[PDB]
From a paper:
Using helical reconstruction and applying C5 symmetry, a 3.2 Å-resolution map of the fd phage capsid was obtained, which allowed derivation of an atomic model of the capsid. In agreement with previous predictions, the atomic model reveals a pentameric (C5) subunit arrangement of the pVIII capsid protein, which forms a single α-helix containing 50 residues. The helix is terminated at the N-terminus of the mature protein by a proline residue (P6), and residues 1–5 of the capsid protein, which are located on the phage surface, are disordered. Due to helical symmetry, capsid protein monomers stack almost vertically to form a highly symmetrical arrangement along the helical axis. The C-terminus of the capsid protein, which faces the inner lumen of the cylindrical phage, interacting with the genomic DNA, has four positively charged lysine residues exposed to the lumen. These lysines presumably bind to the negatively-charged DNA phosphates, as also seen in other phages. While density for the DNA is observed in our fd cryo-EM map, it is not well-resolved and does not support atomic model building of the DNA genome. Our structure suggests that while Y21 is involved in hydrophobic interactions within the capsid, it does not act as a structural hinge, evidenced by our high-resolution map. Structural comparison with Pf44, a class II inoviral bacteriophage with a prophage lifestyle, shows a slightly larger capsid size (fd: 50 residues, Pf4: 46 residues) and lumen diameter (fd: 24 Å, Pf4: 22 Å). In agreement with previous work, our structural model for fd suggests a circular single-stranded arrangement, as the higher positive charge-density of the capsid protein (four basic residues in fd versus two in Pf4) suggests that twice as many negative charges of the DNA phosphate backbone are being stabilised.
Inoviruses are filamentous phages infecting numerous prokaryotic phyla. The first inovirus identified, named fd, was reported in 1963 as a DNA-containing phage with an unusual filamentous morphology infecting Escherichia coli. Fd has since become a model for filamentous phage structure, infection, and assembly, as well as having found use in numerous biotechnological applications, including the first described instance of phage display, and as a model for examining colloidal-rod phase transitions. A unique property of inoviral phages, including fd and Pf4, is that they can spontaneously and reversibly self-assemble to form ordered but dynamic structures termed tactoids under crowding conditions.
Author numbering:
A (entry chain A), B (entry chain A), C (entry chain A), D (entry chain A), E (entry chain A), F (entry chain A), ...: 6 to 50
The structure:
Amino acid sequence: PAKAAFDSLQASATEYIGYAWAMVVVIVGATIGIKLFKKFTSKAS
Amino acid sequence: PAKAAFDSLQASATEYIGYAWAMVVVIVGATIGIKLFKKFTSKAS
Amino acid sequence: PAKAAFDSLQASATEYIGYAWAMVVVIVGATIGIKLFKKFTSKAS
Amino acid sequence: PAKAAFDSLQASATEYIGYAWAMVVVIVGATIGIKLFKKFTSKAS
Amino acid sequence: PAKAAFDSLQASATEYIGYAWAMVVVIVGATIGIKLFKKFTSKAS
Amino acid sequence: PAKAAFDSLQASATEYIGYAWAMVVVIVGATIGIKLFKKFTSKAS
Amino acid sequence: PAKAAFDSLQASATEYIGYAWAMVVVIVGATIGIKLFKKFTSKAS
Amino acid sequence: PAKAAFDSLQASATEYIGYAWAMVVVIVGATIGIKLFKKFTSKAS
Amino acid sequence: PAKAAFDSLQASATEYIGYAWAMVVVIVGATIGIKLFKKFTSKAS
Amino acid sequence: PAKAAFDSLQASATEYIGYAWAMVVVIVGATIGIKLFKKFTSKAS
Amino acid sequence: PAKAAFDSLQASATEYIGYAWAMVVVIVGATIGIKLFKKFTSKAS
Amino acid sequence: PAKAAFDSLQASATEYIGYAWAMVVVIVGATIGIKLFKKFTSKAS
Amino acid sequence: PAKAAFDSLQASATEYIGYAWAMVVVIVGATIGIKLFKKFTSKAS
Amino acid sequence: PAKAAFDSLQASATEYIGYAWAMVVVIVGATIGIKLFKKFTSKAS
Amino acid sequence: PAKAAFDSLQASATEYIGYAWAMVVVIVGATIGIKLFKKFTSKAS
């Protein structure tokens, strides 16, 4: 029982890591994009 | 008589262990899943 | 008797897991939404 | 009993989410308004 | 005699279960309500 | 006897819930007020 | 007993709120005063 | 004899309840007072 | 016997409350003093 | 009997330690990775 | 008879103490190791 | 016993307060010194 | 016989109270010392 | 017997206090060192 | 048993301190390097 329990728990943890990574990638890309747009547009002009 | 009594008692104990293990596996999986979901969703955002 | 008792207990546990999951999903969605709204509105402005 | 308990708890949580959202909307609107007023008035002059 | 005794005992147990369930429902609703109020009011502000 | 005992216990629990709710309302109002005063006075100046 | 206990607890909480409010008023007045002095003296000169 | 025995036992129990209630009221007041003092003094400063 | 026992217990509890209050007063004064020193010295400079 | 019982218990404990270590290694690696990604991407830009 | 009985009982108790000490040493080492790993890895990063 | 225990605890707390105060005084002096050196050297030049 | 028996029992109880008080004083002093050291060293730095 | 038992227990407790103090001293020194290194290196640069 | 347990625990703690120190040294070197590069390149040009 411990075998299956721990294996399923690890698999679920890995999937959750995957979804979390996708979401943080999206969020971080958006925030760095807005910051870079602000900085470049402000300084270059 | 003692032979059959003790053997039946041990078999019943083993089955009860089996059902208990199944139920705790389900419960522990659920609670660890909810805790991991909370932690990952909170920190990653 | 043990069969029916354990089966009913497991079924009730599964239903309780379901309701708990629904409620935590709602709560976590709300809290992450408010936090994301605050962060994006504050930084983007 | 679990049905009614969980349903009432979810409904109360939803209402609390509603009031919290209204209050944070007001607070965030006020703070972004004051910050934008300061920034625009300072730079434009 | 055993019939009536056990039936009455089971009925009394069922009624006691009913009153206990009502009281715990009230208590749990109150405590979760106060905790949720504290959490939402603290974080949203 | 169980009728009266459980009814009185539930009534006492309800009254205690009432006093607890009043006190937490006062405490939470005070703490959110001080926090909001600090935040608004600090940022607006 | 619950009457007197809760009433005394609420009264003590109210007094503590009073002292806390006085102290934060003093502290916030001092910090805003120093910040305003710095800002006005620096910019006006 | 049972009349007097049970009546005296109930009276003694009631008095013991009274002394216990007084002592717990004192103890609970003290502990909540110290906790509230710590919380308010820490946060308000 | 109950009279003397409860009275002595209450007196001992009161003395313990006194020593605890003295110690927490000292500790809280020290910690708030260090925090205020840090804050004022950092901001004023 | 004590020999075999304690030896089996220690072996099972060791295996459980192994699975727990694997899972925490995965979880800690993921969380430190996301935190480091956030920090480096935010500061370097 | 009492001599041999008590001596054997004490010897068995001593051996059981030995096995228990070994097992708790292993368990405590594992749990403190995982906690220290978590703390150091989280803070140092 | 409570007398000596509380007195020794208060004395140890007072000594710890003393060492902590000495160390924070040193640290705060150093950090304010470096900040003031940076500010004065940068602006005066 | 009851005189001597009860007197000896009370004396033995008093001595046991003495040793227990000494040991708890030592243990409590140690644990409060370590906790205070951790708290002061962490916050003051 | 109580004499020797309590004396040995107190001695063992004292030794355990010693080892615990050594270990916490090491751990606290390490953590304060890393925190101070981070703070000084970050601010001074 | 306590001897070996505490000695092994201290040794493991020391090794963990070593790895943590190496990693923070690398991280801090990198972050200070990037900050210094940015500052010098921006100002000198």
